[PDB]
Design a protein around this ligand. Sequence first.
Ligand code: F3S
Ligand code: F3S
Ligand code: F3S
Ligand code: F3S
Ligand SMILES: [Zn+2]
Ligand SMILES: [Zn+2]
Lengths: 103, 103
Amino acid sequence: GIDPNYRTNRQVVGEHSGHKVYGPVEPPKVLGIHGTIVGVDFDLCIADGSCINACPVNVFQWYDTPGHPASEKKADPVNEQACIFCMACVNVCPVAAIDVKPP
Amino acid sequence: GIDPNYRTNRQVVGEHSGHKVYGPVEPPKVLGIHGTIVGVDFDLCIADGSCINACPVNVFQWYDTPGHPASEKKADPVNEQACIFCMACVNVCPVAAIDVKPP
Ligand code: F3S
Ligand code: F3S
Ligand code: F3S
Ligand code: F3S
Ligand SMILES: [Zn+2]
Ligand SMILES: [Zn+2]
């Protein structure tokens, strides 16, 4: 599962669709974590889709990541700021790849 | 159109589904304004639906108001806190019944 201390343990290295990306990032095998309010560890995500299936406010969208060993698609927190802190995604993810921290 | 100063001009008289309701409220003809972040004047709303049709984060839901002269259904800001301040609803409403104020 995702490191609950990722925001302090990792370096921010870039930005994607309005959110920060925490490294290391060495495409295509290592993609890091996307998001600050709603963080998704792309290296753990296996594209199960329960998060997208549970979120009532459309926080996630599928984002293609060809060449990644865990999956070739990931749930990207494009609308992380719409999060109403349901904590559903955090609990439905079979690999515990999501961490939500209210700002 | 809605009074942009409604939050100070009107009295809060109740709560509905997690949001405040600003009076006067004398059902069924006078229902007031629902919401603080995303305020919808139920007395102006005619159930056009453009707001629901435009909102990407599901802020609104239909709420029945039988007996109201403007319409018998209203767009209720059930998820006002998911608002990402698109200002779309504010502009699509044909009667300017919506006012959005970031907290
Ligand atoms: S595996 Fe990925 S698709 Fe969602 S349910 Fe977990 S973050
Ligand atoms: S289910 Fe959606 S509302 Fe936030 S707690 Fe997860 S991104
Ligand atoms: S009329 Fe009502 S249904 Fe929406 S578009 Fe205007 S608040
Ligand atoms: S379109 Fe939706 S995101 Fe807010 S500005 Fe209106 S309730
Ligand atoms: Zn991203
Ligand atoms: Zn309401």
